[PDB]
């Protein structure tokens, strides 16, 4: 355990949050990093115990606290409530990839096995100083703008059969999701404005789910795969959550998860020929914080046009108990927190140090 340093291709002049933060938090990236491929080397990579995750977590919180300041921040303390009030300027907010790099004397091992699901032996190991850049996206249910798998969709659950852990499946193809505000639609309720619509290609969704259920079927060979919505909980979990600029969006993903594949077929979409699965979204001012337990309020919406363009690169799916089920397994998209989002990106890297002094017996004797 050491502390890694960050690097990014900061611009530092657009007064955007990530560039402003990066200006003083990070160094320039390495223009010519080297990579050494090791030969017959096997290494155990445990993504669930990778401490790089906690370090990434701390840097992201600092970025957020130094930028997206709420008007009101409520922190319970045990059990009174502490209220912090701050100026509420809006800021430009667009993630930049950030690289993590080893300090002198350390190196990072990388797992290059495209079929490795984690928690075990990686049979292709190389060494680098820096990881690739990762975009610090904060979201739930569907993770966004991450890396893609080289060939196939990969399930990376710590334990397929535990039911208290996520699936965090990553995709080998990104699916574009386009969320827009109905610009210039200004309407108010009385004794709307806060609306958005997200369009998902139905074709991509259908292909993606067919491939996912095939993998789930391999894990559960005698069962039908059925998808559902959440059972309840905080809005950030029940609906899909993301942000762009200073706007925090909540989208109803029900239209994406009501299928049941068994013979790799559902007809969940009636060949509706619409070609678009659309989600109803809302923009909120009072949200639950992801940064530990607490609540926060942000200033009301920007008067112009807001657009988000994202790549669905994985699903933080979970599974039901299954104990009382007969021939069917139920999956639900609701779930995720930030540590899980980083585990899905940092699983390929481990930091180690060489200890050059070793002992072995041999045939020589020292003359005495």
């Amino acid at each position, epitope marked *: 355990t050491t502390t890694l340093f960050c690097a990014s291709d900061a611009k530092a002049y657009d007064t955007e949050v990530h560039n402003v933060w990066a200006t003083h938090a990070c160094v320039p990236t390495d223009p010519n990093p080297q990579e050494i491929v090791l030969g017959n080397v096997t290494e155990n990579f445990n993504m669930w115990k990778n401490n790089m995750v906690e370090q990434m977590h701390e840097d992201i919180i600092s970025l957020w606290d130094q930028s997206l300041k709420p*008007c*009101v921040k*409520l922190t319970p303390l045990c059990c009174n409530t502490s209220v912090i009030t701050q*100026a509420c300027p809006k800021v430009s907010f667009e993630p930049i990839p950030i690289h993590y790099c080893a300090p002198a004397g350390f190196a990072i091992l990388k797992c290059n096995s495209k079929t490795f699901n984690g928690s075990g032996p990686c049979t292709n190991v190389s060494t680098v100083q820096c990881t690739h850049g990762i975009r610090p996206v904060v979201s739930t249910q569907l993770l966004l703008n991450g890396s893609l798998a080289e060939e196939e969709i990969v399930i990376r659950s710590e334990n397929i059969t535990d039911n208290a852990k996520t699936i965090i499946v990553q995709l080998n193809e990104a699916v574009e999701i386009n969320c827009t505000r109905p610009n210039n639609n200004t309407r108010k*309720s*009385i004794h709307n404005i806060r609306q958005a619509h997200c369009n998902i290609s139905k074709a991509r969704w259908n292909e993606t789910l067919g491939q996912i259920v095939a993998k789930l079927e391999e894990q559960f060979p005698n069962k039908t795969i059925i998808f559902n919505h959440s059972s309840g909980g905080d*809005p950030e979990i029940v609906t899909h959550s993301f942000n762009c600029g200073g706007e925090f969006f909540y989208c109803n993903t029900t239209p994406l998860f009501n299928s049941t594949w068994n013979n790799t077929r559902t007809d969940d979409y009636p060949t509706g020929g619409e070609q678009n699965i659309t989600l109803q979204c809302r923009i909120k001012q*009072i*949200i639950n914080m992801w940064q530990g337990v607490g609540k926060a309020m942000y200033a*009301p919406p920007i008067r112009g046009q807001i657009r988000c363009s994202s790549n669905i690169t994985g699903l933080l799916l979970t599974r039901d108990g299954g104990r009382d089920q007969n021939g069917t397994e139920t999956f639900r998209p609701g779930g995720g927190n930030m540590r899980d989002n980083w585990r899905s990106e940092l699983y390929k890297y481990k930091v180690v140090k060489i200890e050059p002094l070793g002992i072995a017996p041999t045939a020589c004797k020292r003359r005495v």
Partner: antibody
Amino acid sequence: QVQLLESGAEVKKPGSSVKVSCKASGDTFIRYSFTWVRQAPGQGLEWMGRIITILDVAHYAPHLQGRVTITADKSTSTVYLELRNLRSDDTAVYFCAGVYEGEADEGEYDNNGFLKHWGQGTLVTVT
Amino acid sequence: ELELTQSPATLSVSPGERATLSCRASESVSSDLAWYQQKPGQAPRLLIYGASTRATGVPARFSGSGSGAEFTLTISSLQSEDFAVYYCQQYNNWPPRYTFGQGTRLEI
């Protein structure tokens, strides 16, 4: 559309405290924010402070920060103003006013400054 | 800080005439003004919302506009029931601070 109703009149000895209130009715309490106004004789509509009911948070005019507490009872739809260290300078007609915050319950609160639903005004004096 | 300076508050106007009222800020204010009509013994009802929006149930006679530190209100075809004390208030600060006006009376 809250039929905000005023309380009775009060008289206190200087240095004392007074607590007055308004009852909101006909809609959800949590969907309205409330402020207090003091119509002192010869004055304009002096602002005392503001309370948020979705988030139990309140803000006060600087000259009253060590003297005024604004609270609410979520179960009785009641807005309260407590003023301490009373002076003859505080003789005034006191009242609440509501602001509608649509879908505050779901996190859509705007925190507007437009006062539309007013109480009737209660006189508080000292003696 | 932010203060509101109003017109002389003795506006001599006949019914049927267009009265002109004003609201000057010591600091810039966005369209965060509220104009109210106070009658003796009555609530100071809001008539203009956000410097220019009719607040609901408000006659077209009563209208206004403004920006920065200079805002106005005019009352066209003034009626006898409109000879009220008018207030201009500002809520543009956060943490909240309210400029609550002074009060102007129309006269005749």
